[PDB]
Write a protein that binds this ligand. Sequence first.
Ligand SMILES: O=Nc1c(NC[C@H](O)[C@H](O)[C@H](O)CO)[nH]c(=O)[nH]c1=O
Ligand SMILES: O=Nc1c(NC[C@H](O)[C@H](O)[C@H](O)CO)[nH]c(=O)[nH]c1=O
Ligand SMILES: O=Nc1c(NC[C@H](O)[C@H](O)[C@H](O)CO)[nH]c(=O)[nH]c1=O
Ligand SMILES: O=Nc1c(NC[C@H](O)[C@H](O)[C@H](O)CO)[nH]c(=O)[nH]c1=O
Ligand SMILES: O=Nc1c(NC[C@H](O)[C@H](O)[C@H](O)CO)[nH]c(=O)[nH]c1=O
Lengths: 146, 146, 146, 146, 146
Amino acid sequence: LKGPELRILIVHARYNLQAIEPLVKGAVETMIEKHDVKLENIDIESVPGSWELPQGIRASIARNTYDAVIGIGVLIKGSTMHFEYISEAVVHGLMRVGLDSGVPVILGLLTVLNEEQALYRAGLNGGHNHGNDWGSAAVEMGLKAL
Amino acid sequence: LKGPELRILIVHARYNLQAIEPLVKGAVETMIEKHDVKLENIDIESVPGSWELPQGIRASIARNTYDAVIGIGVLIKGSTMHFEYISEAVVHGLMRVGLDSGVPVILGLLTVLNEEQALYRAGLNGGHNHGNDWGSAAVEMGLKAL
Amino acid sequence: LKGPELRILIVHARYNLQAIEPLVKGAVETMIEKHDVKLENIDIESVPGSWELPQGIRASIARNTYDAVIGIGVLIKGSTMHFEYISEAVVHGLMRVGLDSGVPVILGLLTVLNEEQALYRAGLNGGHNHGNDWGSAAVEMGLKAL
Amino acid sequence: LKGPELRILIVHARYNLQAIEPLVKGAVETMIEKHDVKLENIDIESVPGSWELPQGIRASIARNTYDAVIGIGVLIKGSTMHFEYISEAVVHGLMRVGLDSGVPVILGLLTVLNEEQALYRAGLNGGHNHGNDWGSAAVEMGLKAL
Amino acid sequence: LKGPELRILIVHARYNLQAIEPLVKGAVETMIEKHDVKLENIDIESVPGSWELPQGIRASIARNTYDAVIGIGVLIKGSTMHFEYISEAVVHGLMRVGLDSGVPVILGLLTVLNEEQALYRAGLNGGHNHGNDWGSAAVEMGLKAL
Ligand SMILES: O=Nc1c(NC[C@H](O)[C@H](O)[C@H](O)CO)[nH]c(=O)[nH]c1=O
Ligand SMILES: O=Nc1c(NC[C@H](O)[C@H](O)[C@H](O)CO)[nH]c(=O)[nH]c1=O
Ligand SMILES: O=Nc1c(NC[C@H](O)[C@H](O)[C@H](O)CO)[nH]c(=O)[nH]c1=O
Ligand SMILES: O=Nc1c(NC[C@H](O)[C@H](O)[C@H](O)CO)[nH]c(=O)[nH]c1=O
Ligand SMILES: O=Nc1c(NC[C@H](O)[C@H](O)[C@H](O)CO)[nH]c(=O)[nH]c1=O
């Protein structure tokens, strides 16, 4: 599946940047190299934390036109219930924004127990980079939308 | 109950295809063989993962007209909280799409602890294929809708 | 409280019929015998499972006019997380349908760990039939709605 | 803070009346004695159970005009998952009704493990009556609304 | 990032004031000192408890115009399930208000097991004041909104 005409938006948070960067890279590279997406057609915005993800995406969806958007963030369990509540709220938020707008929203949210799990799913320490999968999913949903 | 005039949509994810195929088959066969649904009147779309299910269904519901739709996906517990949050979000999502559109959405989502449980509910290893039940449910809700 | 003019709708699922029948009976009998509701004024629809409850109710609410509706279903914990997710989604769904329509929706949903608990709350094995309470609640909310 | 002109609505369920009455009293008395709210300006409706709370409040909010409303109910953990699902649904429902209507809805819902805990929070057995706090909150939000 | 023209709203609850004051201070000081936000351009409202947070914010969002709002509250686990249900409802409520209005809502909600954890995240006893981070997040989201 190739989408030379696809316009993709990527909004990522900045918490746990060590895990986030590889994820964004994987997503971008895969779209470009495996799906012929054009670098100029990929916008990359960022927000402070995962909580801002739904809101950041919604604001951008109103500004420009995209065929698909990927929300990327990394939530790690802490000592409080903060993680549980934010996670639940962000996941529902992302789903709402996609259903409300009609624009496919790909879930690049990692909700892990600790750092190691995040890094692993970002392709480090022998793991598989999940951003790659998200890249392909974005392309696919973008096309099926047209 | 027979629905020769019913138009049914089936959207399934592609994760855990070993479990998904039998489910789709069961659903289709049952509708055709037990309810006189016409093969030509059954559309089968697919999406990457369960997360795309609500969005895929919504997009299609807008394109064409269906009497009922079946969302099929298989979520398996992993090492992180990913499973819990995606499950909760997809289930609420599917319910929303059905209530928003007025089109009956049948739940063919399996949320299991491991592969064996999925395969079992797909009719393998002595289990009962749940896709069959979903097929009948779709037909029934489609008729009651008219 | 008597509601001779009340029009009540009862939508019940068909899973765990052993527990469902007594519940419907209790609800109907109580409304008729204790509240003077007229048998002709009580519609009884059914759907495959609890998941279809919100959707079934919504469809009917659009067709005819009712003063109150009772959603009856029985969900039993199985081996997977299926029970937890369906339960949460159905409960939110029923609440939405009632708030969206302005029509009182009485919760006749049992979310139990096993069969015995269901049967018991259906008035068998020394238990109290909860359908009765639901019957009275429906009548009361219907009147307060007018 | 005094609100002589405030019109307050109180909707309470009837389950666990032993705990509910003290709560309503505390709320009413505090508003009157500490905030100069007029007895004639306080409406008190009731519903069967906590599930009817959101619906009861919504119906009344449409009938008359209020500056604030207090939802009072007592949910006690039983042997099934009933408590968990009803609790979650009612809390979300009350929040929705307030955000939808723009009318402040004060949470006078107790979600406890057993009777003792309820009675205690109702001011009995050495406890502090929480209805009092709700009374003050209602007055405060009602004023800030104007 | 500097926002001399930004208008920021801060709504905080009054429960656990020992933890709330430092949080508000941190937020305000950071915006002013690190982002050139003007003291006159920062409104600070308050509400009784965290439950009133979404409602308070919504009311204010309707009155005036803000570029971003920060919701600050502290919920501590008690002996009942009260904490769990209020937390879930408030977090979803805040997300809704931001998505509904299009105005960025920063989450300054602490959901902790005990006081010590709250104080610690408020910058006391060797901890880092989280209000600071919230201040920067507000400024950032406010600008990206314009
Ligand atoms: O706290 N842990 C995390 C976190 N908190 C930041 C929050 O999303 C937000 O920026 C403000 O709290 C309120 O606006 N954000 C993440 O993306 N991952 C975490 O693991
Ligand atoms: O991860 N496990 C699973 C899964 N992840 C895929 C996800 O739904 C989606 O494709 C992207 O994450 C975000 O768009 N999807 C499933 O259907 N089952 C699983 O068991
Ligand atoms: O599975 N257990 C149960 C159940 N599944 C059926 C489901 O509601 C529905 O019919 C289809 O899954 C998707 O449309 N329905 C119940 O009322 N109780 C249960 O205990
Ligand atoms: O069951 N326990 C409780 C309860 N059930 C009643 C329910 O709210 C309703 O009246 C009907 O079920 C469906 O309409 N209601 C409460 O306020 N507290 C409880 O502790
Ligand atoms: O109870 N514990 C807490 C609490 N209850 C107050 C509640 O938010 C509200 O004021 C009324 O209950 C209903 O309107 N509020 C908090 O901000 N933190 C807590 O730790």
